[PDB]
Ligand binder design. Structure first.
Ligand SMILES: Nc1ncnc2c1ncn2[C@@H]1O[C@H](COP(=O)(O)OP(=O)(O)O)[C@@H](O)[C@H]1O
Ligand code: BEF
Ligand SMILES: [Mg+2]
Ligand SMILES: [Zn+2]
Ligand SMILES: [Zn+2]
Ligand SMILES: [Zn+2]
Lengths: 291, 668, 204
């Protein structure tokens, strides 16, 4: 286990629980986060808007630095912390009516880095990227939690959550099996997450002199899917993630490899972006929007 | 003894000799080596060179030391280090890195600086040698020259997106939740079967989590060879450069660079045949140093790379993007600007070999300076590029002028008519051999961004090809909408064009427009249109013949000119400095003069349009920059109008007919 | 038999393995690339250098140190390639072509592959008319497997010596013998007019 991850998770829980600030001149001191929990419970939403400045003011920004610098490891800890917060306050919306996959979509980050400004050191961190939507994919279901039927000692077992790579349960409903031959999925019991791969171009203004617009592929999940418009300037907030690449095998330079009987896997990757918050950069509707 | 097996490198001797060279290097030694005793200046040659440089490097906090090879050559005791580094760059460079760390620690400790030593201790100091011998070409590299530091130079055709490079991998036994750390050794990160600790032992216990791993940045750059010497019947080659760390995104496409790196050969895998390598190795060149700035060419425009400069500062690439100006050199710039015949001197220092084409040489210089790049912060912009057309009789030296401009300019592409196509310029789609996936490259116009695109034999070019010129010609950008690509490309390229009047020889009978034979839209965009005319003048022809013959007197002749001309290095310094610091503005008197000239001009021969006004504005701005002024004055506008009148030979042109009288068309 | 220059058509399967001289034009010459003769692996666990010979277009690397100790002891040493320690050779896959004189009536010229190796590289350029002498060696069949019927062999010519029919201008050295043939021309007198009338004497 990791002590730092659990400690940061409980610190996040505490900071969320005791979040306090004056609300303007009216509303007195409003626990905006704790009240917005039930505000989004009213519609049973699935997003929790974590403004960066809230996380940044407390603990002299140490919590914000920890979250931004190592988001990928901390995210499941934050999920467990949010579940515990729901358990302590406002537990009425936890069940889907299994449990709603609440989305933590950060925003109001300090700076937005361009596609050309993407760097290999900052992978696994949180940032914002601004580009032009050029190609979007379909809303194809993505396997997040799966139900597996064991070829041996046959039965149905759910809650075998899917990882980035395929995962199957080593333990069986009848333990005498302990075999993983043909664990079979089923439609009615597995759980899926909405998925979408959007291709973005570099903006015209930020194009370097004498260079082509570098592109990028961005993954959209949850309620943030099907939000972008082809040809619409949009900003994406999330974490840089690497995905396997089978094209860059003939490129010059040595290649990462493993040894384990060769026991060798050709290891190449290309950088992509998993996004959480995306925004676009009757006359009564327009009037309502009008100040 | 104790040498590394397979090399003559001994750690103790190499470290000692490099330390002695670092402590005891005097630039007077190099000047003696380079036959610069006549040019020696002990006012700065006696001081410790690399010691002062390392003091500056410590003060600034930069982590990269750009070491010169000939510096190692000059100092006698470290002469062998030159060959050792040339033959064994990897181990020798690591040794130099350690020696720099030790010597910097010693320098800090001896001076007894108060700040804590451990704060700066944890930092990798990298030495980036360069200028390691002559180019030698690249096709001549025998396989015995593997892993030897070499010097290459050429154009940068294309650059790949940054590719992450795994160096440290993170495994995790899922049941025991134990994180794993394995480094890289010659490109392999071993998979552990059992766990690192003694918690559990399983055959397939851990799983790789790629995101947790540590990735370094690697970018592949395609360079096209431009050797000084090329064997007969050889087409230009292409070598795949590989860069790392801060050098990522340092080089943009179209940059004539001078790259130093390590020659490398790598086995290549058969297609879909798992883990079978072809015997014939694939050769690629590593990158340690890049020399963008050269004294034979103007510096890269600051305006175009201004946005990228902040990103470079973030990266701290430590590449010399723009050459720095010495203080005494700035004083020399000021005194040269103080000269009375600054204009003639600068004009004639451009293409010194060309004879008696002063008006044309001028226009070329005014193009080289350029107008003010005004930035309308509300929206839109105006660029100070000036485009020149040279429609003239044959054998008038126009192609030579284009060649000289192409050599001088930082990012220029030479093109000749039918050797061009619409898709050939702008941008296109192509398939790389290595990735085997479709990529986008840059045409001549995009590669000429921030420079001059010398377009030769303009008239022979098709009307179809010339159509795309308008977009980059007027608003200095190209917006393509083709199969798969929909975007806008900023091509701030000043077009220089040479053409022959239809008939190949100017017809006195037909007007200027009919001889030039260009559509009014394309013709009007050209700021200056030069009617170079070859007239049979006995005195002028005699002088030209004498000059050309005197060129043939000796094998490597110094140019035969009566008047003194500036060094090309100093001219590049002047032009770069004037372009990048000074941004002139217009005055009320200049405004009135511009309006009056535009009105009087608009009163058959081509009719002046508002493009003529913009050309006058840009020419006045360019002239202001040449004198080093921060404002433009009415005499500069009058000079611009005079240049416009002289380029088309307005005095000798008939007023209403448009025909040219040959008696009055005589020149100097 | 090596003295007689042979056209490409006359290089039948009988001449395989011999030393032959083929006369024809050179059309395509590849760039010089490093070809692996023996590849050297380093196993740091047992401190042994193991060398695997390569004698084909392809090969396969190793996983277990095949030296005595790692194969014998329980220690299983990981071995890594070393390019500098390995053996390479300058290699060029040229391609000679039949001349117009050698082609029979009605046919078209056919080509033969040449594998120039070692220090002999860069001695052949496109458009050259040469008599390359080499060893006519066979190679395993490389085409489609369906067309294969038996142990079919693709053939090449490992170049040994190159003789240029027309010497290059850039390769002139005034050796004493060239000096004498030349001064004999000088002493002939009126070298300009004699050389002028010399070209195409059949034209009056
Ligand atoms: N005024 C001149 N000054 C210098 N060289 C000249 C001049 N006029 C002709 N030449 C020489 O004659 C040739 C003609 O130049 P070139 O650019 O090839 O002609 P064109 O203008 O037809 O393209 C070149 O070798 C050039 O050096
Ligand atoms: F005869 Be020239 F190239 F205009
Ligand atoms: Mg010409
Ligand atoms: Zn089972
Ligand atoms: Zn374990
Ligand atoms: Zn071994």
């Amino acid at each position: 286990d990791d002590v730092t991850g659990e400690k940061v998770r409980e610190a996040f829980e505490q900071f969320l629980e005791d979040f306090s600030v004056q609300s303007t001149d009216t509303g007195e001191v409003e626990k905006v986060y704790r009240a917005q929990i039930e505000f989004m419970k009213i519609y049973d939403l699935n997003t929790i808007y974590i403004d960066y400045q809230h996380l940044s003011m407390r603990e002299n920004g140490a919590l914000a630095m920890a979250i931004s610098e190592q988001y990928y490891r901390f995210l499941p800890f934050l999920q467990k912390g949010l579940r515990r917060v729901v358990r302590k306050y406002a537990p009425e919306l936890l069940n889907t009516s299994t449990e709603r996959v609440f989305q933590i979509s950060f925003f109001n980050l300090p700076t937005v880095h361009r596609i050309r400004d993407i760097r290999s050191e900052k992978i696994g961190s949180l940032l914002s990227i601004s580009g032009t939507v050029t190609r979007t994919s379909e809303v194809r279901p993505e396997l997040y939690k799966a139900s597996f039927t064991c070829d041996m000692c046959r039965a149905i077992v759910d809650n075998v959550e899917q990882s980035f790579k395929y995962t199957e349960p080593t333990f069986c409903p009848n333990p005498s099996c302990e075999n993983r031959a043909f664990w079979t999925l089923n439609v009615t019991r597995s759980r899926f997450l909405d998925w979408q791969k959007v291709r973005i171009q570099e903006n015209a203004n930020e194009i370097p002199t004498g260079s082509m617009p570098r592109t990028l592929d961005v993954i959209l999940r949850g309620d943030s899917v099907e939000r972008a418009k082809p040809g619409d300037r949009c900003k994406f907030t999330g974490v840089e993630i690497v995905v396997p690449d089978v094209t860059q095998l003939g490129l010059p330079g040595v290649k990462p490899s493993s040894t384990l009987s060769l026991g060798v896997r050709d290891l190449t990757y290309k950088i992509s972006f998993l996004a959480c918050h995306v925004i676009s950069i009757d006359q009564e509707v327009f009037l309502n929007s009008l100040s | 003894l104790r040498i590394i097996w397979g090399t003559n490198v001994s750690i103790q001797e190499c470290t000692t000799n490099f330390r002695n060279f670092l402590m005891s290097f005097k630039y007077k030694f190099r000047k003696i080596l380079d036959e610069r005793e006549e040019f020696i200046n002990n006012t700065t040659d006696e001081e410790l060179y690399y010691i002062k440089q390392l003091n500056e490097m410590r003060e600034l906090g930069t982590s990269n030391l750009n070491l010169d090879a000939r510096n190692l050559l000059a100092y006698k005791q470290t002469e062998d280090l030159y060959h050792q580094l040339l033959n064994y760059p990897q181990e020798v460079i690591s040794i130099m890195d350690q020696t720099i760390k030790d010597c910097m620690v010693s320098l800090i400790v001896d001076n007894n600086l108060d700040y804590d030593l451990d704060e700066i201790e944890t930092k990798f100091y990298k030495v980036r040698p360069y200028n390691v011998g002559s180019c030698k070409g690249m096709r001549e590299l025998n396989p015995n020259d593997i892993d030897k530091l070499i010097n290459l130079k050429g154009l940068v055709l294309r650059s790949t997106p940054v590719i992450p490079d795994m160096k440290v991998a993170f495994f995790k036994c899922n049941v025991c939740d134990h994180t794993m750390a394995v480094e890289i050794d010659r490109g392999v990160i071993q998979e552990p079967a059992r766990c690192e600790r003694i918690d559990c032992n399983e055959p397939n216990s851990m799983s790789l989590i790629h995101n947790r791993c540590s990735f370094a940045d690697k970018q592949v750059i395609k360079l096209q060879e431009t050797p000084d010497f090329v064997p007969d019947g050889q087409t230009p080659h292409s070598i795949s450069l590989c860069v790392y760390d801060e050098l990522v995104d340092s080089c943009r496409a179209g940059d004539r660079i001078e790259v130093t790196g390590t020659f490398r050969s790598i086995p290549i895998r058969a297609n879909s045949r798992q883990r079978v390598l072809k015997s014939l190795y694939k050769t690629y060149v590593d990158v340690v140093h890049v020399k963008k700035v050269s004294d034979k060419r103007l510096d890269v425009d600051t305006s175009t790379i201004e946005q990228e400069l902040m990103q470079n500062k973030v990266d701290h690439n430590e590449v010399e993007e723009v050459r720095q100006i010495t203080d005494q050199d700035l004083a020399k710039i000021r005194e040269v600007a103080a000269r009375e015949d600054l204009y003639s001197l600068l004009a004639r220092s451009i293409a010194p070999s060309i004879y008696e084409l002063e008006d044309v040489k001028k226009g070329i210089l005014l193009q080289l300076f350029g107008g003010t790049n005004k930035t309308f912060t509300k929206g839109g912009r105006y660029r100070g590029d000036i485009n020149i057309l040279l429609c003239g009789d044959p054998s008038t030296s126009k192609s030579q002028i284009l060649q000289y401009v192409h050599k001088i300019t930082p990012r220029g592409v030479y093109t000749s008519g039918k050797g061009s196509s619409a898709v050939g310029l702008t941008a296109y789609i192509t398939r790389d051999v290595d990735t085997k996936q479709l990529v986008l490259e840059s045409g001549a116009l995009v590669l000429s961004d921030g420079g001059v695109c010398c377009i030769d034999e303009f008239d022979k070019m098709s009307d179809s090809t010339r159509s795309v010129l308008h977009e980059v010609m007027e608003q200095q950008t190209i917006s393509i909408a083709k199969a798969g690509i929909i975007t806008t490309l900023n091509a701030r390229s000043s077009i220089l064009a040479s053409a022959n009047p239809i008939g190949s020889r100017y017809n006195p009978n037909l007007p200027v427009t009919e001889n030039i034979d260009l559509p009014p839209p394309l013709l009007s965009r050209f700021d200056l249109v030069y009617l170079v005319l070859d007239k049979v003048d006995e005195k002028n022809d005699r002088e030209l013949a004498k000059h050309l013959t005197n060129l043939y007197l000796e094998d490597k002749p110094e140019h035969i000119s009566q008047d003194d001309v500036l060094p090309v290095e100093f001219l590049t310094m002047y032009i770069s400095y004037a372009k990048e610091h000074i941004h002139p503005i217009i005055t009320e008197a200049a405004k009135t003069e511009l309006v009056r000239a535009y009105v009087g001009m608009r009163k058959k021969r081509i009719t002046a349009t508002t493009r003529q006004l913009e050309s006058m504005i840009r020419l006045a701005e360019a002239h202001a920059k040449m004198k080093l002024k921060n404002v433009v004055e009415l005499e500069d506008v009058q000079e611009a109008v005079r240049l416009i009148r002289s380029a088309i030979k307005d005095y000798a042109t008939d007023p209403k007919t448009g025909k040219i009288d040959m008696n009055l068309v005589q020149t100097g | 038999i090596s003295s007689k220059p042979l056209s490409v058509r006359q290089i039948k399967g009988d001449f395989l393995g011999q030393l032959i001289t083929v006369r024809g034009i050179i059309t395509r010459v590849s760039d010089v690339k490093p070809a692996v003769e023996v590849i050297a692996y380093t196993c740091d666990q047992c401190g042994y250098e193991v060398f695997q010979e390569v004698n084909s277009r392809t090969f396969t690397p190793l996983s277990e140190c095949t030296s005595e100790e790692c194969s014998q002891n329980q220690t299983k040493g990981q071995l890594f390639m070393s390019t500098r320690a390995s053996k390479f050779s300058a290699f060029q896959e040229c391609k000679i072509q039949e001349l117009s004189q050698q082609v029979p009536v009605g046919h078209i010229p056919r080509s033969l592959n040449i594998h120039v190796n070692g220090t002999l590289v860069r001695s052949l350029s496109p458009g050259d008319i040469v008599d390359v002498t080499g060893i006519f060696l066979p190679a395993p069949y490389t085409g489609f497997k369906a067309l294969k019927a038996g142990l079919l062999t693709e053939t090449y010519l490992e170049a040994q010596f190159v003789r240029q029919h027309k010497k290059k201008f850039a390769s002139f050295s005034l050796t004493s013998d060239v000096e004498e043939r030349v001064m004999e021309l000088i002493t002939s007198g009126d070298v300009y007019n004699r050389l002028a009338k010399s070209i195409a004497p059949e034209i009056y």
